[PDB]
Design a protein around this ligand. Sequence first.
Ligand SMILES: *[C@@H]1O[C@H](CO)[C@@H](O[C@@H]2O[C@H](CO)[C@@H](O[C@@H]3O[C@H](CO[C@H]4O[C@H](CO[C@H]5O[C@H](CO)[C@@H](O)[C@H](O)[C@@H]5O)[C@@H](O)[C@H](O[C@H]5O[C@H](CO)[C@@H](O)[C@H](O)[C@@H]5O[C@H]5O[C@H](CO)[C@@H](O)[C@H](O)[C@@H]5O)[C@@H]4O)[C@@H](O)[C@H](O[C@H]4O[C@H](CO)[C@@H](O)[C@H](O)[C@@H]4O)[C@@H]3O)[C@H](O)[C@H]2NC(C)=O)[C@H](O)[C@H]1NC(C)=O
Ligand SMILES: *[C@@H]1O[C@H](CO)[C@@H](O[C@@H]2O[C@H](CO)[C@@H](O[C@@H]3O[C@H](CO[C@H]4O[C@H](CO)[C@@H](O)[C@H](O)[C@@H]4O)[C@@H](O)[C@H](O[C@H]4O[C@H](CO)[C@@H](O)[C@H](O)[C@@H]4O[C@@H]4O[C@H](CO)[C@@H](O)[C@H](O)[C@H]4NC(C)=O)[C@@H]3O)[C@H](O)[C@H]2NC(C)=O)[C@H](O)[C@H]1NC(C)=O
Ligand SMILES: *[C@@H]1O[C@H](CO)[C@@H](O[C@@H]2O[C@H](CO)[C@@H](O[C@@H]3O[C@H](CO[C@H]4O[C@H](CO)[C@@H](O)[C@H](O[C@H]5O[C@H](CO)[C@@H](O)[C@H](O)[C@@H]5O)[C@@H]4O)[C@@H](O)[C@H](O[C@H]4O[C@H](CO)[C@@H](O)[C@H](O)[C@@H]4O)[C@@H]3O)[C@H](O)[C@H]2NC(C)=O)[C@H](O)[C@H]1NC(C)=O
Ligand SMILES: *[C@@H]1O[C@H](CO)[C@@H](O[C@@H]2O[C@H](CO)[C@@H](O[C@@H]3O[C@H](CO[C@H]4O[C@H](CO)[C@@H](O)[C@H](O)[C@@H]4O)[C@@H](O)[C@H](O)[C@@H]3O)[C@H](O)[C@H]2NC(C)=O)[C@H](O)[C@H]1NC(C)=O
Ligand SMILES: *[C@@H]1O[C@H](CO)[C@@H](O[C@@H]2O[C@H](CO)[C@@H](O[C@@H]3O[C@H](CO)[C@@H](O)[C@H](O)[C@@H]3O)[C@H](O)[C@H]2NC(C)=O)[C@H](O)[C@H]1NC(C)=O
Ligand SMILES: *[C@@H]1O[C@H](CO)[C@@H](O[C@@H]2O[C@H](CO)[C@@H](O[C@@H]3O[C@H](CO)[C@@H](O)[C@H](O)[C@@H]3O)[C@H](O)[C@H]2NC(C)=O)[C@H](O)[C@H]1NC(C)=O
Ligand SMILES: *[C@@H]1O[C@H](CO)[C@@H](O[C@@H]2O[C@H](CO)[C@@H](O)[C@H](O)[C@H]2NC(C)=O)[C@H](O)[C@H]1NC(C)=O
Ligand SMILES: *[C@@H]1O[C@H](CO)[C@@H](O)[C@H](O)[C@H]1NC(C)=O
Ligand SMILES: *[C@@H]1O[C@H](CO)[C@@H](O)[C@H](O)[C@H]1NC(C)=O
Lengths: 66, 346, 98, 320
Amino acid sequence: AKLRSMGYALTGAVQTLSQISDINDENLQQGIYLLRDHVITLMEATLHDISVMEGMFAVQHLHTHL
Amino acid sequence: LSQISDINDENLQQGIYLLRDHVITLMEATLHDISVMEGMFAVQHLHTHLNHLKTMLLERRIDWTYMSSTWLQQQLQKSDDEMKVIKRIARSLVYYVKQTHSSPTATAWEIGLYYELVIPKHIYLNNWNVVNIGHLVKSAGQLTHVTIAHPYEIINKECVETIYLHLEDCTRQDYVICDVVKIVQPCGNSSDTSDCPVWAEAVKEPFVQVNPLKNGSYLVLASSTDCQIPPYVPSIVTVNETTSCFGLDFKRPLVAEERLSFEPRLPNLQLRLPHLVGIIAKIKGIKIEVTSSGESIKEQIERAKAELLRLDIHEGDTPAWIQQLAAATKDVWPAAASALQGIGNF
Amino acid sequence: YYEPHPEPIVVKERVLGLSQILMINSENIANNANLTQEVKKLLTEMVNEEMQSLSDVMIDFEIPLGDPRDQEQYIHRKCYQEFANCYLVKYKEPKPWP
Amino acid sequence: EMQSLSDVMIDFEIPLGDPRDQEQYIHRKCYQEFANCYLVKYKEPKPWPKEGLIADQCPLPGNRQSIWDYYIKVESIRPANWTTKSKYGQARLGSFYIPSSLRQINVSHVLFCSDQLYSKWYNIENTIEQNERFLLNKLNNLTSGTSVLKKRALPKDWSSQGKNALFREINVLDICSKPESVILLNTSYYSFSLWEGDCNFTKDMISPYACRFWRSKNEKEETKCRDGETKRCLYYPLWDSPESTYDFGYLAYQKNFPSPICIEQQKIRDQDYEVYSLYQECKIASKAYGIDTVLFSLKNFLNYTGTPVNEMPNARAFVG
Ligand SMILES: *[C@@H]1O[C@H](CO)[C@@H](O[C@@H]2O[C@H](CO)[C@@H](O[C@@H]3O[C@H](CO[C@H]4O[C@H](CO[C@H]5O[C@H](CO)[C@@H](O)[C@H](O)[C@@H]5O)[C@@H](O)[C@H](O[C@H]5O[C@H](CO)[C@@H](O)[C@H](O)[C@@H]5O[C@H]5O[C@H](CO)[C@@H](O)[C@H](O)[C@@H]5O)[C@@H]4O)[C@@H](O)[C@H](O[C@H]4O[C@H](CO)[C@@H](O)[C@H](O)[C@@H]4O)[C@@H]3O)[C@H](O)[C@H]2NC(C)=O)[C@H](O)[C@H]1NC(C)=O
Ligand SMILES: *[C@@H]1O[C@H](CO)[C@@H](O[C@@H]2O[C@H](CO)[C@@H](O[C@@H]3O[C@H](CO[C@H]4O[C@H](CO)[C@@H](O)[C@H](O)[C@@H]4O)[C@@H](O)[C@H](O[C@H]4O[C@H](CO)[C@@H](O)[C@H](O)[C@@H]4O[C@@H]4O[C@H](CO)[C@@H](O)[C@H](O)[C@H]4NC(C)=O)[C@@H]3O)[C@H](O)[C@H]2NC(C)=O)[C@H](O)[C@H]1NC(C)=O
Ligand SMILES: *[C@@H]1O[C@H](CO)[C@@H](O[C@@H]2O[C@H](CO)[C@@H](O[C@@H]3O[C@H](CO[C@H]4O[C@H](CO)[C@@H](O)[C@H](O[C@H]5O[C@H](CO)[C@@H](O)[C@H](O)[C@@H]5O)[C@@H]4O)[C@@H](O)[C@H](O[C@H]4O[C@H](CO)[C@@H](O)[C@H](O)[C@@H]4O)[C@@H]3O)[C@H](O)[C@H]2NC(C)=O)[C@H](O)[C@H]1NC(C)=O
Ligand SMILES: *[C@@H]1O[C@H](CO)[C@@H](O[C@@H]2O[C@H](CO)[C@@H](O[C@@H]3O[C@H](CO[C@H]4O[C@H](CO)[C@@H](O)[C@H](O)[C@@H]4O)[C@@H](O)[C@H](O)[C@@H]3O)[C@H](O)[C@H]2NC(C)=O)[C@H](O)[C@H]1NC(C)=O
Ligand SMILES: *[C@@H]1O[C@H](CO)[C@@H](O[C@@H]2O[C@H](CO)[C@@H](O[C@@H]3O[C@H](CO)[C@@H](O)[C@H](O)[C@@H]3O)[C@H](O)[C@H]2NC(C)=O)[C@H](O)[C@H]1NC(C)=O
Ligand SMILES: *[C@@H]1O[C@H](CO)[C@@H](O[C@@H]2O[C@H](CO)[C@@H](O[C@@H]3O[C@H](CO)[C@@H](O)[C@H](O)[C@@H]3O)[C@H](O)[C@H]2NC(C)=O)[C@H](O)[C@H]1NC(C)=O
Ligand SMILES: *[C@@H]1O[C@H](CO)[C@@H](O[C@@H]2O[C@H](CO)[C@@H](O)[C@H](O)[C@H]2NC(C)=O)[C@H](O)[C@H]1NC(C)=O
Ligand SMILES: *[C@@H]1O[C@H](CO)[C@@H](O)[C@H](O)[C@H]1NC(C)=O
Ligand SMILES: *[C@@H]1O[C@H](CO)[C@@H](O)[C@H](O)[C@H]1NC(C)=O
C-alpha cells in the first residue's frame, strides 16, 4: 500500500504562465493558472537573524521558527 | 477491550470501544533532549514544548510527542500511509487539570486526556462532485424543465474502473468522514441498471442559463437559439475568437498542455415522457414526479389519466378550454387543431 | 456534469477510545538540569503560567472507565516520581561527630 | 519538528514538470552541498620533512588553540630510565610533535572544504545572498568549460602566475588556528625560535622579559628513584618549562619588547600546484548525467578517507 492523491491533477489539461505579472492580462477568464517554474529557497539564506547569533542561542531561535 | 490489538477482531460491529486501563506517562521520561541541557537553556526548551501542547489542545488536536509511534503502529497493525490518515483525523478532549503540589521553588500538575481514533474501512482519493443540469421540453404550449434523480452523489475513479458512491451521516475532521457508503449502479432501462424517478417542473419563457466552466468552455441551456447553439438540449460550448452570445462575451481560452485524464464517461439513456407532461406540471404548481427510467408504456400512462380526464369542459371557460384542446391535438391531428382554434376565436 | 473534490473520503469501520494521564513534576526536571534556587523559581513560575491558562477554559467531563487510584501502573509511577531515591539510615545507637 | 509534519501528510500529484530538470534547482543544490569544497594536486608527492615543529608565535596553555592537540607537555614525574628519543623521536619536549598520519609518503592530492582562505572579496559582514552571487560570478570568471581554476586564482606561494583573485596567502599565526592546512599545503617550512642555541646564537652574542632567550639548555636529561624503578620517579629536563610565562613568544612576535628571534627556511614542495572546484564540476557534470547520479558520485569522493570532509569542523577540514 502506497497512497498518492490526483485531487489537484484530475482534468487532464493545465494552463501555465511564464511570469506572475501575466495573471493581470485582461483577456484571461475565471480559472486556475499555474506559474510554470518552481520557486527554490534555502532557509539559511532566508533567516538572517540566526547568522549573527552563536551557540545554543542560534539553535533555540531556529526551533521557534520551525 | 483488554488490548489495543483487539480492535481488529472481525466479529465486532461499528461502535465505540474503550481500552480498559489508563496510559500513565511522566514528561521528564518523554523529553530526553532537556535531560542533557543545563541552566536556562533547559528551562527555555521546556517552555517551547509546554506552549505547543497548549496550542494543539485548544484546536482539539493530539500532540503525538507523548506516545510512541512504533508501539501504536505495532498494536494497530497498519501500513505507513494508513497511520498518516489515522493520525491526521484523530481528536482530543481535556477531562481534568489538577495542581498536586505548590511550593515557591516546586510545583506538580496532572492532566487527563481522552482520545477518539477513527479506524478506516476504505479510503477514496480520486473523487468528482455530481451537478444535475437536466433538459427543457415544450409540451401542449407549456415549457417544462425535466431532471433525473440519481442514486449517487460522488463518482470515484482510482485507475480504470469507475464507481458510483451514495454517502450517509458525514462530517469534516480535515477530510470528509462518513458512517455509511453504499456502491450503486447508474440509471437505465434494463435489469442490470437503476430504475430512478424522473421529476418535471413548469418554468417561465424565455429561459436562459449560461455557466462559465474553469477550463474556459461554457455550459448552455436555453429556450431559444443564438450563435448556432441548438435549443432545449444542453451542451458544452467553445469558440476560437471572442464573441457576444445571449447578451454576454464568450472568450477564446488560453492554450493548455495535455495530461492523463480521470474524467468519468456515463452510459447513454433514451427516456420516453407522457404526451401532456406540460399540462401535468402546470396544474400542480410544484416540482412533481412523472416517470421512472425503466417504466412500461401502460404504467406510465395510467398515472395522471384520471386527474387529466376530470379537467372537463365547463359553462364558464369554454373558449379557454377549447384553446387547450387545440394545443394538445396539434401534433396528433393538425387539421382538427386548426378547426378547434377557429371555433375558439369565434 | 462534474467538478473535482480534492479532499480525501474515509469510510468509518469503528472508533477506539483511550485515556492518557500526563504527570508533570518540576523537582525531577530541576535535578537533571543542575538548576540553582534562583532558576528553580523561574521554572516554577513558567510551568504554572502555561498549566493554569489551560485549566481556565476547560470544564470537567465524566469518562466511563474505573478510577486510576485502583490501577497498579498509576500506583507504581506515582510512588517512583515522589520517592525513588529517598532512604532512611538507623545508627546502632546515637553517636555524633566528635 | 520535520518528522512530526511528515507523519500526518499524504502525497499529492501536482501537474508541473520535474524540479530535477530545472536550472535553479540544479544550481542551488550543488551550492548547498559543494560551494567551498576544493581539490589541490602537488607537482609530485612530497611530505612535511620533520616530526618536531618549533613554533613560538603560538601562546601555550597555562582562548583554546587548535595546535594544543600536538603540544608535548613537560611532566615532573616519569618512569625509570625514560627518554624523549624512546617516544617522540627527535622532538624538543615542551614543543609540538607531528604524527606520521599527517606525513604519508604516497599522498598526491589535498581535499578541503572551508571558507577561511578566501582573499578580501569575501566578508562575513556582507549578506549570504551577496556572498553567494560574488562567489558564483568569480568561479564563472576564473573557469572555461572544465572544473580547473585559472592560475590567476591562486596565491603567489602556490604558483608563479598567482594574483590572489580567489585565495589569500597563508601567514605566520595560521599554524596556531589551522595546523593541518599549513602542514599539508605550505611549500616551505619557516621556523620561529627564541631557544638558546639555534643559528649558533650564544647567550653572550646579543649586539620585564627584555633581551633574553625563552628556554635555556641544561647539562643533560636524567631521572632518580628511591627503590621503586617502575611508576613514580622525578625527571630532570634537557630544557626549561614555559608554564610560568606561557605568553613569551606570542608577546615577542607582536613586538612589545625586543628579543633575539631566529627564523630559517626549508623548501618542501615546488610552486606549481593545480586546483579543481567541486561546485563547478557538480554544475557541469549534472548537465550530462543528471543531478541524482552526480550528487551521489561526488558525495562518495568527500568520504574517500572514511570520514566525510564536509561534516568536519570548518577550521580543521583538510585531508590528504
Ligand atoms: C473542458 O472540459 C470538458 C469536459 O468537462 C471537455 O469536454 C470533453 O472533451 C473531450 C475531448 O477531450 C470529449 O471526448 C471525446 O469524445 C468523442 C465523442 O465520444 C462519443 O462518440 C464516440 C464515437 O461514437 C461513434 O462511433 C462509434 C464507433 O467508433 C459508434 O459505436 C457510435 O455509435 C458512434 O457512431 C464514442 O466512442 C464515445 O463513447 C464513449 O463514451 C460514451 C459516453 O459519453 C459511453 O456511453 C461509451 O460507452 C464510450 O465510453 C467507454 O468506451 C470508450 C472507448 O470506446 C472509453 O474511452 C471510455 O472510457 C468508456 O470506457 C462517445 O459516444 C470521442 O470521439 C473523442 O475521442 C478522441 O480521443 C480518443 C482517445 O481517448 C481517440 O482514440 C479518438 O481518435 C479521438 O481523438 C473524445 O473521447 C468529451 O466528450 C467532452 N466531454 C463532455 C462531457 O462534453 C472540454 O473539451 C474542455 N474544454 C476546454 C476548453 O478545454
Ligand atoms: C607557511 O608559509 C607562509 C608563507 O605563505 C609563512 O609565512 C611567512 O613567514 C616568513 C618567516 O617568518 C615571513 O618572512 C619574514 O618576515 C619578517 C618580517 O618582515 C618585515 O621586515 C622585512 C625586513 O626585515 C621587510 O622586508 C618586510 O616588508 C617586513 O616589514 C622578516 O624579518 C624575515 O626576514 C628575515 O628572515 C629571513 C629568513 O629567510 C631572511 O632571509 C632575512 O634576511 C631576514 O633576516 C633573518 O632574521 C632572522 C631573525 O629575524 C635571523 O634568524 C636570520 O639569521 C636572519 N638572516 C639573515 C640572512 O641575516 C622574513 O622575511 C613572511 O612575512 C610570512 N609571510 C606572510 C605572507 O605572512 C609561514 O611562516 C609558513 N608557516 C610554517 C609553519 O612553515
Ligand atoms: C423502457 O423500455 C421499454 C421496453 O422497450 C419501453 O416500453 C416499450 O415501448 C415500445 C416503444 O414505444 C413499445 O413498442 C411497441 O410494441 C407493440 C407491441 O407490443 C406487444 O408486444 C410486445 C412483445 O415484446 C409486448 O412486450 C407488449 O407487452 C406490453 O403491452 C401489453 C398490452 O398493453 C401489456 O399487457 C404488457 O404487460 C406489456 O406492457 C405487447 O404485448 C407494437 O405494436 C408497436 O409497434 C409500433 O411501432 C413500430 C416501430 O416503430 C412500428 O413498426 C409499428 O407499425 C407500430 O407503429 C411498438 O413496437 C413496447 O410495447 C413497450 N413495451 C412495454 C413493456 O411497455 C419503455 O417505453 C421504456 N421506458 C422509458 C421510461 O423510457
Ligand atoms: C474544434 O474542433 C476541431 C476539430 O474538428 C479542432 O481542430 C483541431 O485542433 C487541433 C489543435 O491542437 C489541431 O492540431 C494542430 O495541428 C497542426 C497541424 O495539422 C496537422 O497535424 C495535426 C496533428 O498535430 C492533424 O490533426 C491534422 O490533420 C494535420 O495533419 C499543428 O500545426 C498544430 O500545432 C496543432 O498540433 C488539429 O489539427 C485540429 N483538427 C482538425 C480536424 O481541424 C479545433 O481546435 C476546435 N476548435 C475550438 C474552438 O475548440
Ligand atoms: C564565529 O567565530 C568567528 C571566529 O572568531 C567570528 O569571526 C570574528 O568576528 C570578530 C567580531 O566581528 C572579528 O573581530 C574584529 O575584526 C575586525 C576586522 O578585522 C576588527 O576591526 C575588530 O577590532 C575585531 O578584531 C574577527 O575579525 C572575526 N574572526 C577572525 C578570525 O578574524 C564570528 O563573528 C563568529 N560568529 C558568530 C558570533 O556568529
Ligand atoms: C550536571 O552536573 C553534573 C556534575 O558535574 C554533571 O556530571 C558530570 O558530567 C561530566 C561530563 O559528562 C563527567 O566528566 C567526565 O567523566 C567521564 C567518566 O568518568 C570521564 O571519562 C571524562 O574525562 C570526564 O571527567 C563527570 O564524570 C560527571 N560528574 C562527576 C561528578 O563525575 C552532569 O553532566 C551535569 N548535567 C547536565 C549538563 O545536564
Ligand atoms: C564513509 O566510508 C566509511 C568506510 O568505507 C563507511 O564505513 C562503513 O559504514 C557502514 C555503515 O553501515 C558499516 O556497516 C561499515 O562496517 C563501515 N566500515 C568501516 C570500515 O568503518 C561509512 O559508512 C561512510 N560514510 C558515509 C556517510 O558514506
Ligand atoms: C607507497 O608507494 C610505494 C611505491 O608505489 C609502495 O612501494 C608502498 O607500498 C606504498 N605504501 C607505503 C606505506 O609506503
Ligand atoms: C653554525 O651555523 C652554520 C650554518 O651553516 C652551521 O653549518 C654550523 O654547523 C654552525 N656551527 C656551530 C658550532 O653551531
